[PDB]
Amino acid sequence: GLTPQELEAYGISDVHDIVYNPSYDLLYQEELDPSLTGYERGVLTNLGAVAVDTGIFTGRSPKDKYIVRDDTTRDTFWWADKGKGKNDNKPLSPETWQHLKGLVTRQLSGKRLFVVDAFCGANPDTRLSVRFITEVAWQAHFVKNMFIRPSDEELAGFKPDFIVMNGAKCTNPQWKEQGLNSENFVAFNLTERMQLIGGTWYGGEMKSGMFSMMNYLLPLKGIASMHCSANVGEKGDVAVFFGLSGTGKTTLSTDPKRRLIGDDEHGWDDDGVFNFEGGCYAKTIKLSKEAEPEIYNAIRRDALLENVTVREDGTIDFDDGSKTENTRVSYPIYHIDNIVKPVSKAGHATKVIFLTADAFGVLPPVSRLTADQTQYHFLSGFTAKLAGTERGITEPTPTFSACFGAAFLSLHPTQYAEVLVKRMQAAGAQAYLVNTGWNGTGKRISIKDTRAIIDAILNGSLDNAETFTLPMFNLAIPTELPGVDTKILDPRNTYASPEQWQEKAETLAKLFIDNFDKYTDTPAGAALVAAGPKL
Ligand SMILES: Nc1ncnc2c1ncn2[C@@H]1O[C@H](COP(=O)(O)OP(=O)(O)OP(=O)(O)O)[C@@H](O)[C@H]1O
Ligand SMILES: [Mg+2]
Ligand SMILES: [Mn+2]
Ligand SMILES: [Mn+2]
């Protein structure tokens, strides 16, 4: 356990009630306490899982993310203001940090506090020992699910390496005078080894905050740090699935034929690929028990639903995105039946899958990448969406996010690329581009077809298939694949003619070219242009 004087050390005073390492049973009764008000309230669903609303913030707030610039961070961080590409790593002063710390520590003072000790990183040599402090039971539940739950033995010798103080209920009235974005804040200090959260209740800030910290510390020690899911076959063949939010990393890694290593966040060291987390954070929008039975089955007692609409009878409307499109459920990883255990890690990845949801309907469902294309597409980090749907228009809107996760990058995209390539080359890994998004049907490729594509990548079918070169993007695509619909494999087949596809392909290529130009300020970047799409 821990004493109230141990919290004083952090600046939190007069804490009468400390709930250290709350059990799942305790979190359940806390959440369902009928006297809770506002966003603290949990409701019990017919699936046995507790549902909560995360408040005004139903996703991350990258515009409120700040990192203290000091002698420890100055020369290594990928700062928002240093002319090295757009990012959310906005510099914060030590003085302004101290003000934010006072807000949170005063807010947590005199309150009933939940303290969750956990690990970020499956390996003792590189894991953070994180102490999370919160005044909201469901927030403690979120981190219990999403971080590695220490054994009783590990708890006895637990020494925090990082402190996360969640003061969601407090705001910053000085934000205007302090040059900040809003009264809310998601702040990091690498000198004091601390994250502070104010204003936003969204639990994801804690998950993505610690990921940002691993993304900083690990590649500085030669370890790749990756926004990917990962799984392993019976033979010990490991695959990682990169991709932006909504591209299928959680959906497609949850494959009953494969043992799940992890959902979202992985390191790659001398020994192999290892999960940072102790749980999975699935999307539930339009969730289908038939399409995703394993994810659906995971939704039960100890899972935590977010922003879903719950009917009066306790049933959930998974289709209802009224509160948000970003409806989620966290659950501890063992809610998945086939997982790597007791420790979430395996060997070196030999299959590297880049997932993308191409709203432009240009990209093939699968193509095997060249070495240079792998690098080009990794730095590009493309996905798109239909932004106009609620208005009855397409509005395909592109996102280029370096390393398929620029939002969590603490170092230059190039540093992530370099270490990924080093690990890939030593392992003889191969890379694949998968479009889990749209084609000329104006509809998304089915989950079934995509799963059958993944099967073909993993089992070697794709590697041994006859291929030809898709024009413009110069992508090796197969003529056919076992278990896959042949028509869809060539992105041109779902339009009236190849020329209608070409119109869209030219548009998309120009976006890639315009976007990549920022990487050409170096000889290696400039050399990668040849691997990109060509008009
Ligand atoms: N062909 C397809 N392949 C994969 N997912 C699909 C497909 N068609 C529809 N989907 C839906 O797209 C979403 C993919 O979301 P998923 O949870 O895998 O995102 P993610 O890549 O894990 O993102 P995050 O980093 O935010 O966790 C799900 O809602 C899934 O039901
Ligand atoms: Mg996911
Ligand atoms: Mn007192
Ligand atoms: Mn993610």
Q: Which of 143, 150, 269 is nearest to 211 (CA)?
A: 143
Burial label for 99, CB within 10 Å (0-12, 13-18, 19+), is: middle
- Residue 260 contacts residue 341 (beta carbons within 8 Å): no
- Angstrom distance (rounded) from CA 478 to CA 313: 49
116 and 208 both lie in a single domain: yes
Q: Which of 374, 505, 491, 483 is nearest to 438 (CA)?
A: 491
Q: Is 391 helix (H, G, I), strand (E, B) or coil?
A: helix
CATH number at residue 121: 3.40.449.10
Helix ranges (H only) for 354-492 are 371-380, 413-427, 447-459, 461-464
- Residue 203 contacts residue 142 (beta carbons within 8 Å): yes
Containing 166, the helix (H) or strand (E) segment is: strand 162-167
Q: Which of 275, 281, 282 is nearest to 238 (CA)?
A: 275
Burial readout 321-347 (b: 16 or more C-beta within 10 A, e: otherwise): beebebbbbbbbbebbeebbeeebbbe
Q: Which residues pair with 385 in a beta bridge?
A: 397
Atom of ligand 1 nearest to the CA of 251: 18
288 and 169 both lie in a single domain: no
Q: What is the DSSP string of 316-361?
A: EETT--SS-S--EEEEEGGGSSSB--SSSB-S-EEEEEEEE--TTS
Burial label for 312, CB within 10 Å (0-12, 13-18, 19+), is: exposed
| Residue that finishes a domain, picked among 180, 204, 222 | 222
How many structural domains is the chain composed of?
Answer: 3
| Residue that finishes a domain, picked among 336, 356, 374 | 336
394 and 443 both lie in a single domain: yes
* CA-nearest residue, atom 4 of ligand 1: 248
The alpha carbon torsion through 460, 463, 466, 469 (nearest 10 deg) reads: 140
* CA-nearest residue, atom 1 of ligand 1: 447
CATH number at residue 290: 2.170.8.10
Atom of ligand 1 nearest to the CA of 247: 21
200 and 283 both lie in a single domain: no
21 and 165 both lie in a single domain: yes
Atom of ligand 1 nearest to the CA of 282: 17
Cα angle 407, 409, 413 (rounded to 5 degrees) comes to: 110
- Angstrom distance (rounded) from CA 13 to CA 105: 8
Containing 26, the helix (H) or strand (E) segment is: helix 24-32
Q: Which CA distances in Å does 435 have to 15, 214, 311, 379?
A: 52, 28, 35, 17
- Angstrom distance (rounded) from CA 284 to CA 387: 19
**Where do we find the tokens 């009917």?**
311
- Angstrom distance (rounded) from CA 450 to CA 35: 46
Provide the token pair at 439. 């084609």
* CA-nearest residue, atom 27 of ligand 1: 245
Q: How far is the CA of 454 from the centre of ligand 1 (A)?
A: 14
Residues at CB less than 6 angstroms from ligand 1: 243, 245-252, 264, 281-283, 285, 436, 444-447, 450
296 and 382 both lie in a single domain: no
Containing 167, the helix (H) or strand (E) segment is: strand 162-167
- Residue 310 contacts residue 51 (beta carbons within 8 Å): yes
197 and 316 both lie in a single domain: no
Strands 238-243 and 349-356: parallel
| Residue that finishes a domain, picked among 222, 237, 267 | 222
- Angstrom distance (rounded) from CA 132 to CA 161: 11
Containing 43, the helix (H) or strand (E) segment is: strand 42-44
- Residue 461 contacts residue 481 (beta carbons within 8 Å): yes
427 and 503 both lie in a single domain: yes
- Angstrom distance (rounded) from CA 308 to CA 324: 8
416 and 319 both lie in a single domain: no
318 and 417 both lie in a single domain: no
Q: How far is the CA of 25 from the centre of ligand 1 (A)?
A: 30
Q: Which residues pair with 92 in a beta bridge?
A: 68
- Angstrom distance (rounded) from CA 487 to CA 465: 16
Phi-psi region of 486 (alpha: psi -120 to 50; beta: other; left: phi over 0): alpha
The domain of 301 spans 38-58+279-336
| For ion ligand 3, residues whose CB falls within 5 Å | 14
399 and 489 both lie in a single domain: yes
295 and 426 both lie in a single domain: no
Burial label for 428, CB within 10 Å (0-12, 13-18, 19+), is: exposed
Q: Which of 175, 205, 194 is nearest to 105 (CA)?
A: 194
Q: How far is the CA of 281 from the centre of ligand 4 (A)?
A: 8
Would you give the distance in Å from CA 528 to the centre of its chain?
27
Q: How far is the CA of 508 from the centre of ligand 4 (A)?
A: 24
Atom of ligand 1 nearest to the CA of 291: 31
Residue 504 CB neighbours (<10 A): 17
The structure was resolved to a resolution in Å of: 2.2
- Angstrom distance (rounded) from CA 143 to CA 332: 10
Strand extents, DSSP E, 238-297? 238-243, 259-262, 266-269, 272-275, 279-283
Helix ranges (H only) for 190-282 are 204-217, 249-253
Phi-psi region of 420 (alpha: psi -120 to 50; beta: other; left: phi over 0): alpha
- Angstrom distance (rounded) from CA 453 to CA 481: 8
- Residue 84 contacts residue 412 (beta carbons within 8 Å): yes
* Structure obtained using: X-ray
Query: In this structure, what are the phi and psi dihedrals at residue 261, rounded to the nearest 5 degrees?
Result: -80, -50
- Angstrom distance (rounded) from CA 447 to CA 425: 31
- Angstrom distance (rounded) from CA 433 to CA 436: 10
CATH number at residue 248: 3.90.228.20
Q: Which CA distances in Å does 162 have to 112, 190, 221?
A: 21, 9, 18
Provide the token pair at 164. 């996360």
